[PDB]
């Protein structure tokens, strides 16, 4: 069987993009995801009926000084729910944008989980993200993680890419 959810309906200068991610189920368990992407070409000003759901890149912020714990406790979107000292934090985060013009936002909802790696390799959540605003121009939560931490990069690219097969064979 198949259940599908729609991710992003955004008005571009080249049209109206539609991304649909349809997760195929089998005996209850999910098997594979199909990330399809369409386009209604033309010009469309329907900024009232557009949105975007993005799963953000996991950013690993490394705390080394003593002012760093003071900063994110001033961030009202951060709320730690435990009295646990922490060295490094990975923020696995998801966002939901709604637009009002071409690059302004009508609303932003940014939630997410913050994570701590213990020395005994157990992962326990320290707290949560709860950001919500209207009529903004960017996401603060991601822009904070854009400069104050590195992304957990899994797509590690080689220095010189190697061709697999060469000639006309293909």
């Amino acid at each position: 069987s198949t259940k599908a959810e729609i991710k992003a309906v955004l008005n571009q200068p080249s049209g109206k993009l539609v991304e649909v991610v349809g997760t195929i189920y089998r005996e209850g368990k999910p098997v594979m995801e199909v990330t399809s992407q369409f386009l209604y070409r033309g010009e469309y000003n329907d900024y009232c009926n557009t949105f975007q759901k993005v799963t953000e890149t996991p950013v690993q912020v490394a705390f080394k000084s003593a002012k760093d714990l003071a900063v994110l406790r001033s961030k009202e979107w951060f709320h730690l729910e435990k009295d646990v000292q922490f060295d490094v934090l990975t923020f696995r985060c998801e966002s939901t944008y709604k637009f009002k013009s071409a690059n302004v936002y009508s609303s932003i909802k940014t939630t997410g989980q913050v994570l701590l790696e213990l020395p005994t390799k157990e992962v326990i959540q320290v707290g949560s993200v709860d950001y919500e605003a209207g009529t903004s121009y960017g996401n603060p939560v991601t822009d904070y993680l854009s400069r104050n931490g590195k992304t957990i990069e899994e797509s590690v690219i080689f220095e010189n890419a190697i061709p697999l097969s060469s000639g006309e064979e293909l």
């Binding site: 003593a66 002012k67 760093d68 003071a70 900063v71 001033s74 961030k75 903004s136 822009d143 904070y144």
Partner: protein
């Protein structure tokens, strides 16, 4: 008489003056930057 004039204003009655003035200089530097780096990040978060 040879005359010692101890014009030190009571500072010999402070145990471990090195470690005492170290923590007062640290705490005023550690208060100044947490009030800085918060007001730096809260400035740019309003720019976003």
């Amino acid at each position: 008489e040879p005359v010692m004039a101890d014009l030190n204003g009571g500072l010999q009655f402070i145990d471990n003056l090195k470690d005492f003035t170290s923590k007062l200089r640290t705490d005023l530097l550690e208060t100044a930057d947490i009030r800085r780096a918060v007001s730096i990040e809260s400035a740019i978060e309003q720019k976003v």
